[PDB]
Amino acid sequence: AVYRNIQACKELAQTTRTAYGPNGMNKMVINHLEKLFVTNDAATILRELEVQHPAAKMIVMASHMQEQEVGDGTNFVLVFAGALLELAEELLRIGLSVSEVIEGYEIACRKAHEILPNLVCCSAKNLRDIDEVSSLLRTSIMSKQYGNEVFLAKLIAQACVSIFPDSGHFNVDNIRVCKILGSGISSSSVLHGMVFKKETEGDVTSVKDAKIAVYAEELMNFSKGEENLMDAQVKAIADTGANVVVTGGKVADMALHYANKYNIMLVRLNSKWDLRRLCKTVGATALPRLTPPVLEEMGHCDSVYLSEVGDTQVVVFKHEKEDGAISTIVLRGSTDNLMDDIERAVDDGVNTFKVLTRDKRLVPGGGATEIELAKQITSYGETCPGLEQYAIKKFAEAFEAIPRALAENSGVKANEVISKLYAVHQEGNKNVGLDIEAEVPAVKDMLEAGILDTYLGKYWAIKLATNAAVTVLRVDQIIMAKP
Amino acid sequence: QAALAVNISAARGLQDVLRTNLGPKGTMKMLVSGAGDIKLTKDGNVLLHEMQIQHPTASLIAKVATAQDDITGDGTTSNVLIIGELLKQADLYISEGLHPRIITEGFEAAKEKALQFLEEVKVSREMDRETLIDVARTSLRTKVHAELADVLTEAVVDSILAIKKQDEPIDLFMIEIMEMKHKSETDTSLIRGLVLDHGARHPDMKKRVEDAYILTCNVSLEYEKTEVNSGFFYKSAEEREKLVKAERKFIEDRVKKIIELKRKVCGDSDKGFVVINQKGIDPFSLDALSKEGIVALRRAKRRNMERLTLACGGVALNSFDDLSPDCLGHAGLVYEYTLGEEKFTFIEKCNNPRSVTLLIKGPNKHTLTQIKDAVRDGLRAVKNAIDDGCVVPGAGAVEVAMAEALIKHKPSVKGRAQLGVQAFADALLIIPKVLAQNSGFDLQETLVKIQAEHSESGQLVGVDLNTGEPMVAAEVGVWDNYCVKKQLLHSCTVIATNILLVDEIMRAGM
Amino acid sequence: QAALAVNISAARGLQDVLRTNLGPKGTMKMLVSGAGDIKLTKDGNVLLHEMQIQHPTASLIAKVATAQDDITGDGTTSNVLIIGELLKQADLYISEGLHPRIITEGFEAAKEKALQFLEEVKVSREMDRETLIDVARTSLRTKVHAELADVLTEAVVDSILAIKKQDEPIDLFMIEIMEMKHKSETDTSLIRGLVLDHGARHPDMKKRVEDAYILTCNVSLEYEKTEVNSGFFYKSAEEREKLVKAERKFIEDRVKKIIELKRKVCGDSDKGFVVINQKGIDPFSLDALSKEGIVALRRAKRRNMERLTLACGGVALNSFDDLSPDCLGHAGLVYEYTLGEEKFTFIEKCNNPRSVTLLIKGPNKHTLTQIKDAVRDGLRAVKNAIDDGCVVPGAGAVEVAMAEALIKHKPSVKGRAQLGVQAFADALLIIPKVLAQNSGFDLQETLVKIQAEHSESGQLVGVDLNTGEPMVAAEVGVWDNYCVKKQLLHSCTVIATNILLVDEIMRAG
């Protein structure tokens, strides 16, 4: 019952085999909440595509580890692992054992970790400039949202440069993205602090308060008593001194009058996820009752005011006296489906440089370093005696499936690409990757184009991918139990 | 006779199942729980005690590993393989017309000859650090990916030596197991003291204290009920909060003596104090003790308070009215390590805590629970090596040397009993045959190789899992416990007796 | 591997069929021809050569026993028993993953080791009356119903001893086997002379002749064609009678030519004359020769004329015009034997016949055919005993001693072939397991006692069928031939080598 596990993981790769690269195909994602989505992100497929075959889940948990400590290489987990087991079936057809093949991959993983630093050609300059971040973030824009290589390269760079001076404090949790209905990507902008699209309900312009609190005769008597009840609540807020009150629910017409009576800025936020962002930044939590005057659950902010950017009244929550490391990228888009696809490409770019906060090392992509890595591992496999030759030799051919995906997804023949990728590297022309062109099957230097991946990303992508192929091959039979 | 053939063919299938997961070259098996949890493991006891089997007969064999795990904790994989091959060989003799009872007496005679031969192979050498390293490597290899072999070998061995001295009887309760995420699998290490789950929640607590005194208590310092014969005599809601302070007055005064106990017991600088109260503490009470630099913990488990008495020495106090410095413990570098998810307190650097904690680190739960199985399986093998100083060479060296003895053994009980000895000898030889397939070598080449080795002195050869050559298991560092092999000769024969003694099968309401 | 499992279980079923007819205490098998013929026998050659089996794989094993019976003449039942057990034990290792090629190498080593073991235990005892009776007891006991043992034992022994002198090799054509009905089964004895089917039938013949000169002839004494340039031409029935007067001159004148030779060669009293002409004879020639004390026989077989030349010594004649005294023979007592219905000629007490007659007697047809094969199977067992000066002990005593030599034997060629020797050891021990069941005793308890028998000497131990204890086959008079076991181990290894090496079974038309 071993091949049934290989056929299970083989099918999971063929779905994301086409979503790889910039010319990859989109996916008709039907959400469980009676919603329709269209994208080409491989990470979102598995979240919705419920693969119940537990043999393939080991590859998914490896892809989930590709989200921790790194934010790229998800296709590497599914493609490289899926190609490893496809060729592993060719070995067992001859009559090889499972342990010798596992041990051969355990050795090849150590040989691959030593060749990758040799192929590190260039890296970042560590200047904290906008041209440095935008020029290198072109790799994150690839295969997540094509065509916006110019727009998002500078937009993402503007939010990270504000935090790079805070050495060792750059995080993806500090960059919260917002999206507003608009014409297109041209109306996008970048702002500091937390910016929310909802306008200010009150007529208060600016306030530097730190206290931010997030939340027939008888017929006319109780109707006016409610007006005294609401006034007593804003008076309770005035007793606390909170000039900025963030409302999670609905606001009465009389509350707008009392909010301006005591000079209290009143802001409404219907989105719960936007309210959760305030819990982790200023310290103010959302209380369920009608405005509890709890001075302990109020946050701390140096300045709060209303702004208008792109013809949209938006409230600003920045920190002038403190250091400040929060940035908000406000994108504009007419279609909510495609507008969210851009939101994911932004998170992919923020996390790419979050790993570059460590030792900055980059490797060219596009089939350049993967064949150079497969060319050197094959050299160790030819001279290394013993029965490990069949596993190490095929471990190099597993690296070939990735440029084969870049070839087929680009409409280019897969065999002609690898034949030319091996000829240029036989002559020593390193850093030569496949040129993205539907008509030109030729190749060129990717370093001259400005395509550079993360050295620290390929490490964990090759390790988690090979360890998953070991975990799936060690299990030769799946047996059900009833607790 | 056809009714007996069912139990034979029933365990034959269970033999083909648990034969591929023996040794490090063997395969793993998955446990599909159906609720959302997946487990990976090699130990046969885990594949049967928690698993439910299709056939009814094989379900009885599952209880053998349940009783076997309580004695030794290992070897359950090889127990079913000996049982599967015994009844496989016995079927060839019953097919000719022999009764099963005659074959059982043959095994009863082979048990003594095989058990008596065990006295010669075992070695009474002194167990030391270099000897147990050979033992831990033999067990943990079958539970990891050939990478955590040297990592966990040094942890399990040092955990045992640090909790047993002067021929003291050892116990497994002294070793606590902990798991943590957001780390790599090769970062497994040991802890001098005990890692606590719930820490302190206040910014004014000392992140790490080089030296602090411990105080064991079970008094809740939160807003508690009334202790004396009184009540809530009030007239409005504002007066209700006034008597809340009265129910807190008995609580607030008890915390003021804690500061007095700290000031009297080393109230000078370069000192510290750490409270280990199991019950909750109010944020106001923590605010009073945090000013003095007292790192007070709350919401701990009952198991840690019992271990805290052994590690720290502070005696549990039930009331602060009887607060005395006699029940004060002591700890070394008391700190709280910051991880990616939560914070956990450490009380390491104790002189003799009589309890260690093997801190396991892994990214996934199925990987974290797999190593948890390797710890308890690797620890008991070393527990059986020290409590029983006699150990034997693995690699099937005991089974092959025993099998060679049974062929050269005359009938000392009965005449036809020799046939069962011929079958019991061919059963023990399945261990080198099983490991030959998991290694990928020829099943027959491995057998005659280790069998062709003869000399005029002690010569116990074994299987080379990597090459297949006949290799000495004693020199390369492979050793097994005396009680493990002892139970195989008693479990496999007693169980195989009960299966062959079944004549007919009747449905009692099924 | 599946191509072997169909062939493996095909022999296992064939093992359970023929195991119940090994030895005397075993059962018999019936042969239903469908036309009306029914037969009973234990010899495996008849259960496989004349019988039709459903499986083609088992049909190939039938041709092995057919050729085995042509060489040694016995032991074909145990040949298939070892074959069925060789593949049974080979399947135990094939399930573990051993290729059949290495197992054949193990049988090749044990076959040569066991063949060397026969050279050590074989006994070159002198051939005489007392020793051959012990051998013929082994061959005929398994072909009868435990009553014709002592009866037929003396027959086959003295039959071969009569035709063996001057170091001449043995020939089976020197024995004329005849059958007689209307008598009991225990009356089977030996006839020194030759028995003829048809004899003289006339009242004027002598009942017995103490001494007579036998004249060999081949001349036709019935109505024949014209011997001169003429033919049969007539016009009526009366004219046809005149041609009888002419044609009979060629027959009647030849009767007197025998009378002229009678008065010439010993025409006095105390003498006799016997004509053994192969052709038919007219009654006028019988009456003419019967009065002269001349016994005229007719309707003899072609082979009987060949033996008749040896009995008396008279050379075969083809014409009475070429008659001479040189072709006259001589014999002793010549008489006629009387059965319930028919009568036969007996010319016993010959001078130098060099050809004996084993006269079989039985009341039924199906029972006479059972003894028909036991004679050919009994004569050939002792034939190999004298031609092969060495013999081996019976009672399955070779198998239990062979198991001791092969277990105490390591291959000097490779290691993995040692297991093929282990299988060949348990395959040879099936014979004491089979006979223990045919005797009605426990299968394994009989094997323990014969295997446990050991001593500091050369000890031959076998199987006792009457009690079940260890029996020394040399002390009880239980012996076999040396060529039987030699052909057994030489044959059974070749067939197991040819079948186990079959990788696939393709349907070729």
Ligand SMILES: Nc1ncnc2c1ncn2[C@@H]1O[C@H](COP(=O)(O)OP(=O)(O)O)[C@@H](O)[C@H]1O
């Ligand atoms: N235009 C391009 N030129 C060269 N390589 C590309 C291009 N577009 C995508 N790639 C390759 O595709 C790989 C996957 O990119 P990305 O989508 O950011 O990660 P993931 O596939 O894990 O989401 C990168 O390693 C990169 O080398």
Ligand SMILES: Nc1ncnc2c1ncn2[C@@H]1O[C@H](COP(=O)(O)OP(=O)(O)O)[C@@H](O)[C@H]1O
């Ligand atoms: N490479 C090896 N060399 C020698 N012996 C081995 C090897 N691998 C496994 N064994 C033997 O297999 C036996 C059982 O191991 P394991 O499966 O871990 O325990 P259990 O069978 O009780 O679950 C051990 O006693 C050990 O001697």
Ligand SMILES: Nc1ncnc2c1ncn2[C@@H]1O[C@H](COP(=O)(O)OP(=O)(O)O)[C@@H](O)[C@H]1O
């Ligand atoms: N009464 C007996 N007890 C023990 N062994 C016997 C007995 N009769 C025959 N045998 C053995 O059985 C074998 C086969 O004998 P036989 O019947 O003559 O050949 P087959 O069985 O092939 O017809 C012989 O080798 C002989 O040693």
